Amino acid sequence: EKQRVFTGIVTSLHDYFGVVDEEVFFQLSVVKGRLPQLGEKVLVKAAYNPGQAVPWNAVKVQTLS
């Protein structure tokens, strides 16, 4: 409930952050290794803040191939 580990698709990429599955925000600072490309599948660990505008925030993001 409070944290989830999952694979998902990078759905947008911006200067210092991206989004996974249109719902999980990630700062580029939590990416480990190769920067994901748009639409690429990544492994995500994220925390869930329902009392927040953007509920899911990644604590780690990693490409899978």
UniProtKB/Swiss-Prot annotation:
It is found in: Nucleus; Cytoplasm; Cytoplasm, Cytoskeleton, Spindle. Expressed in gastric carcinoma tissue and the expression gradually increases with the progression of the carcinoma (at protein level). Expressed ubiquitously in normal tissues. Expressed in 84 to 100% of neoplastic breast, lung, and colon tissues. The modification N6-acetyllysine is found at residue 60. Genotoxic stress induces its sumoylation and sumoylation promotes the SIRT1-CCAR2 interaction which in turn inhibits SIRT1-mediated deacetylation of p53/TP53. Sumoylation leads to transcriptional activation of p53/TP53 by sequestering SIRT1 from p53/TP53. Desumoylated by SENP1. Core component of the DBIRD complex, a multiprotein complex that acts at the interface between core mRNP particles and RNA polymerase II (RNAPII) and integrates transcript elongation with the regulation of alternative splicing: the DBIRD complex affects local transcript elongation rates and alternative splicing of a large set of exons embedded in (A + T)-rich DNA regions. Inhibits SIRT1 deacetylase activity leading to increasing levels of p53/TP53 acetylation and p53-mediated apoptosis. Inhibits SUV39H1 methyltransferase activity. Component of the DBIRD complex. Interacts with ZNF326/ZIRD; the interaction is direct. Interacts (via N-terminus) with SIRT1, which inhibits the deacetylation of substrates. Interacts (via N-terminus) with SUV39H1; this interaction abolishes the interaction with SIRT1. Component of a nuclear receptor-mediated transcription complex composed of at least ZNF335, CCAR2 and EMSY; the complex stimulates the transcription of nuclear receptor target genes such as SOX9 and HOXA1. Within the complex interacts with EMSY and interacts with ZNF335 (via C-terminus). This is Cell cycle and apoptosis regulator protein 2. The lineage of its organism: Eukaryota, Metazoa, Chordata, Craniata, Vertebrata. The chain holds residues 53 to 117 of 923 of the full protein.
